[PDB]
Design a protein around this nucleic acid. Structure first.
Lengths: 46, 805
RNA sequence: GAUGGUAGGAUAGUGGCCUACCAUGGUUUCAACGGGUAACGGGGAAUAAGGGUUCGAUUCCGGAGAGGGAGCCUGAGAAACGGCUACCACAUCCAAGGAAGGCAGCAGGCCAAAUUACCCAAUCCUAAUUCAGGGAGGUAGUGACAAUAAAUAACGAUACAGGGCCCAUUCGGGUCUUGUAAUUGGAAUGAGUACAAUGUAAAUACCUUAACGAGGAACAAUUGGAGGGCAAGUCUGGUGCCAG
RNA sequence: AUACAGUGAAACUGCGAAGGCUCAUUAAAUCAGUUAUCGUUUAUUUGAUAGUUCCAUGGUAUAACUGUGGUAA
């Protein structure tokens, strides 16, 4: 059954509508998600 | 209900649009219940898709049981309790109770080498061997998702190492850290919470690609051109893959159908279905080919070839371990071992498997030689192909389950399957100055395995060195050379003082099979209830059973390898070994100099290897004592395993010399049962054992000569009469076979022998007849060498008679 | 083993029930032995009913069976609806290593595929018990075969007309308070809507029953038959205006 | 209530289910009554019904339970 939510996965046009170390994961999803953009090299001056 | 992210569905969309695999790494506890959603997204991105799913785990499932009658009666008694209604299933229960899941342990990953899956669920992260990684991400196909679940210790390592360079704090493992950094580098991989949020540390930006295959259309065009008989039927049955594989099958068919002899050897990677092309060409060869064919695979390892043979036969016209017997209905084929079918090679066609080079030269002589060269040595086999046989050997490397994949690129980069044989030196004559210098530096393996770009390029050079034409090692051996406690390395590459650059002249991996350090590491690892890191000590601790070797620490060579240029490369390896003996005797940067002047308290230094001739010559330039071997035929090459161990320490010379003496005493008797190898190499081994005894002993293990009454009891008086009959008459077997055992024993005991007389003593020790051993070795003057052997026997009999009697 | 004798075996014991030995018996025209069914029928097998005279209450058709024969086990009672072993077929899971039970079953259907809900309150049965229970058993619901008794109106007043009805082939004859979408009046209650209480383990239903409930009493029964009549209408025929 | 003391998942226990469908056609041998068993079994019901003793309390071995595990189960 597309256009409906078989389980929880309701399919819109392009978006998907689903539903439902602790503080470490919550902080890495709150602030430190794309904070590791300029953290790749760590002075790797190759 | 909540919209998830603009990137995680779009990644699956463009992954199935470009037919590329993709990697999800999920953290958190409630992570099993989001594989329903990712499998639904993977199917609805493109219905025309494989449905099966792997659940590789190591010891125990997460929250379920994988037995549907068991969980069915469990949910039946849950109904009978009444905490849950009848027609109710949460999506994880529905996912495991409706989908097609194949369950494997992490140990038996070799059981699923052939089949194909749409999804792979790696359950545990902390133990992930790279051979298992290479076996699962290869079988995941182009619309595929490989998901990896995590643990709180890995979350601590993630929060640590996601800042710049820090690690986790207690054998420490860096392969999983190199894994985390590679997934941070990958564009087709990202890390997701248990709540379907995003950690953008691994491939942050991802756009939805635009809505829409020329090599596939060229494949269809050339396939239809070949279509417009039974040759086209075989071509369409084979070409389930790239036009490279189709062109290879067509060219092998053209060069091996009616031309009866060519030597065609198709070389390819782990993909592309080389065995599939062989088994799909088998039916065409049975049609337009001889009545007998000869396969040379491993025994009971011909799954894809036999499956494609039966599949193509059923396509065209058909109907102690396993069954590999020959069948026909309107043909013969046998998957045999090494060439015991020399007189049974009436088959005009033989197809061999990938690399035993001398056994390959023995088997491939008088028929059409098809050969499958899997990459998974090759240069030397191509040289032996060009050194003899209209060789039309050609094949290509386009993938089968993809056209090209960043997941395959990251897997090859992390598991280090990529190689490069470029020079990149200062000079070869200036590397000969390094061969005069014998200068070596340590590896600093923590900073080496920390994935940085130039460090990874030099580490790929080091891996190409450490597995360059080696003795068939593997990715689990790379993980042992990375993440073991008893390990070190040495890169004696450059002598020059130029700018940033260099090479790898010789890698050499040590293994501290110790007493103190190994006892410390083993008492540590007994809390983790595992551990096996003492091979060279434990072989002699049962064979020779010495408390001295129980108390002395030891370094053991895991591997050591140099370039494949010339004999100067063996000179470079000898200089590296001599520099290592000098090194034993006399974040972080990815080298060491002061630690190259540092070591441990080690007594013995040994290398364990197979009994090879050049390895024996290297062991003699090494001159490390040729200690106790084992003549059990290790079925890879059939080579006997010898562990030559020097003692380079304060006071161990009497122990090592007595061990060499016991090995020498055992070898002359053990050359009768299961050591019938050579004459010159046997003399070299006896000379190496006596050289070890002479170098180690001063006058301690100095044996007395053959005593009078004991020598009278060892022979007979009439046996010595027959010896005199050989001295003044013929040396026939009525007096030269009953006494020859004691003759060869006393000759190898203790007053000199020639080269022909030494081969005669070794020939009587090997107990072969006259026309075999001397005619194989010298191949000249058979009866004259037999008379010289009789004269040496007469001189020995005259010496023993004039000594005792 | 036919008939009996003697002894043993096995039995819960009697017993040719089985075996050794011995004798050649035994039933029968005073019906042996054998032949079949309205032996889905009969025999009392039993209750009988205040008029049904072989319809009209029930026990039992014969023995088996728990996939198929075989062997074993348990118990006051068994060759167990609930056990095991081996053989042969069905048959599901399986990671292909192995673990099983029986569902090769019972319900249904060939323009009525829904029975499978509530109780031991009654009668019995088991029960350590002044307690527990019994899919024994009872209660209720969907699932019409127009078979069954009632309703869809009753009673007045006023007005205004002169015609209504019957017979007969015909002419005609015979007779008499009869009509009308005319007005109008207050009484009646029943279907329905519903208080309850009774009933009952409980609930339904029957029984009893306050309140409301009629004018198109629209709170709106059918089915079939006989005959007309009409247009600036349409069609056909042809000796105007007609015939069909 | 410092050797037990009430709620009580899961385990031993006492008992529960204490009598249900289809298929091939047996003529007092299937059945009903009756005579008897000092010819015999019997839980339960009921009435009855036990006489040998030289120079202050008897033994480890298993659960449930903990702990280490295997197996797809």
């Amino acid at each position: 059954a597309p256009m409906s939510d078989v389980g929880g996965v309701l399919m819109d046009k392009d978006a998907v509508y689903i539903d439902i170390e602790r503080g470490e994961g919550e902080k890495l999803m709150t602030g430190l998600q794309s904070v590791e953009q300029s953290i790749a090299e760590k002075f790797d001056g190759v | 209900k909540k919209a998830i992210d603009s990137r995680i569905p779009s990644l699956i969309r463009n992954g199935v649009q470009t037919k590329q695999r993709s990697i999800f790494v999920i953290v958190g506890d409630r992570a099993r219940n989001q594989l329903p959603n990712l499998h639904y997204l993977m199917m609805s991105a493109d219905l025309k898709m494989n449905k099966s799913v792997l659940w590789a785990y190591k010891k125990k499932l997460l929250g379920f049981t994988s037995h549907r009658k068991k969980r069915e009666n469990k949910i039946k008694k849950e109904i009978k309790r009444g905490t849950r209604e009848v027609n109710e299933m949460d999506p994880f229960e529905s996912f495991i109770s409706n989908q097609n899941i194949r369950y494997v342990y992490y140990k038996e990953s070799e059981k699923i080498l052939g089949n194909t899956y749409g999804m792979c669920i790696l359950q545990d992260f902390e133990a992930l061997t790279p051979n298992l990684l290479a076996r699962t991400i290869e079988t995941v196909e182009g619309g595929g998702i490989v998901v990896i679940l995590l643990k709180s210790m890995s979350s601590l390592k993630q929060l640590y190492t996601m800042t710049m360079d820090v690690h986790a704090r207690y054998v420490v493992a860096r392969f999983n850290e190199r894994f985390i950094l590679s997934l941070g580098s990958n564009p087709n991989c990202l890390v997701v919470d248990d709540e379907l949020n995003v950690l953008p540390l691994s491939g942050a930006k991802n756009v939805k690609p635009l809505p829409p295959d020329e090599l596939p259309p060229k494949q269809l065009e050339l396939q239809e051109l070949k279509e417009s008989d039974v040759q086209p039927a075989g071509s369409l049955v084979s070409l389930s893959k790239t036009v490279n594989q189709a062109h290879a099958i067509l060219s092998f068919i053209d060069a091996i159908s009616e031309k009866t002899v060519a030597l065609t050897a198709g070389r390819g990677r782990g993909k592309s279905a080389a065995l599939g092309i062989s088994i799909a060409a088998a039916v065409s060869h049975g049609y337009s080919n001889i009545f007998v064919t000869s396969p040379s695979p491993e025994n009971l390892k011909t799954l894809f070839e036999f499956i494609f043979k039966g599949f193509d036969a059923l396509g065209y016209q058909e109907h102690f371990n396993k069954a590999i017997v020959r069948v026909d209905i309107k043909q013969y084929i046998v998957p045999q071992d090494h060439q015991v079918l020399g007189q049974a090679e009436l088959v005009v066609i033989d197809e061999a498997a990938a690399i035993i080079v001398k056994n390959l030269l023995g088997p491939y002589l008088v028929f059409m030689a098809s050969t499958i060269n899997g990459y998974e040595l090759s240069l030397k086999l191509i040289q032996q192909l060009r050194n003899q046989q209209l060789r039309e050997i050609s094949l290509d490397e386009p993938i089968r389950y993809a056209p090209g994949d960043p997941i395959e690129k990251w897997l090859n980069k992390l598991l280090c399957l990529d190689v490069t044989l470029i020079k990149n030196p200062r000079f070869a004559t200036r590397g000969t100055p390094h061969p005069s210098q014998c200068n070596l530096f340590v590896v600093n393996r923590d900073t080496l395995f920390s994935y940085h770009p130039v460090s990874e390029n030099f580490l790929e050079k080091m891996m190409a060195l450490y597995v360059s034409s080696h003795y068939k090692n593997s990715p689990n051996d790379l993980q042992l050379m990375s993440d073991a406690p008893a390990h070190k390395l040495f890169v004696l590459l450059p002598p020059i003082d130029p700018k940033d650059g260099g090479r790898i002249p010789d890698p050499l991996c040590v293994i501290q099979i110790a007493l103190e350090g190994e006892i410390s590491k083993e008492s540590v690892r007994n809390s983790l209830s595992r551990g096996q890191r003492a091979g060279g000590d434990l072989i002699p601790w049962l064979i020779s059973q010495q408390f001295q070797d129980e108390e002395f620490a030891s370094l053991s060579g895991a591997r050591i390898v140099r370039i494949a240029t010339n004999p100067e490369y063996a000179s470079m390896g000898y200089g590296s070994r001599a520099i290592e003996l000098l090194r034993d005797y006399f974040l972080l940067l990815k080298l060491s100099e002061q630690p190259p002047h540092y070591l441990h308290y080690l007594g013995v230094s040994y290398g364990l290897t197979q009994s090879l001739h050049k390895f024996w010559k290297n062991n003699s330039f090494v001159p490390v004592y040729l200690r106790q071997t084992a003549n059990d035929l290790t079925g890879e090459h059939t080579c006997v395993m010898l562990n030559v161990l020097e003692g380079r320490e304060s006071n161990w010379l009497v122990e090592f010399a007595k061990d060499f003496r016991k090995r020498f005493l055992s070898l002359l008797s053990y050359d009768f049962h299961k050591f019938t190898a050579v004459q010159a190499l046997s003399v070299i081994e006896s000379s190496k054992k006596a050289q070890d005894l002479s170098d180690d002993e001063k006058h301690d293990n100095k044996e007395l000569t053959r005593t009078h009454l004991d020598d009278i009891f060892s022979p007979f008086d009439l046996k010595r009469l027959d010896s005199y009959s050989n001295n003044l008459l013929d040396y026939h077997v009525i007096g030269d076979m009953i006494p020859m055992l004691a003759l060869l024993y006393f000759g190898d005991k203790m007053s000199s022998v020639q080269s022909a007389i030494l081969l005669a003593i070794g020939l009587q020790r090997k107990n072969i007849d006259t026309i075999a051993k001397e005619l194989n070795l010298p191949s000249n003057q058979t009866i004259a060498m037999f008379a010289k052997i009789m004269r040496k026997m007469s001189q020995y009999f005259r010496q023993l008679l004039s000594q005792s009697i």
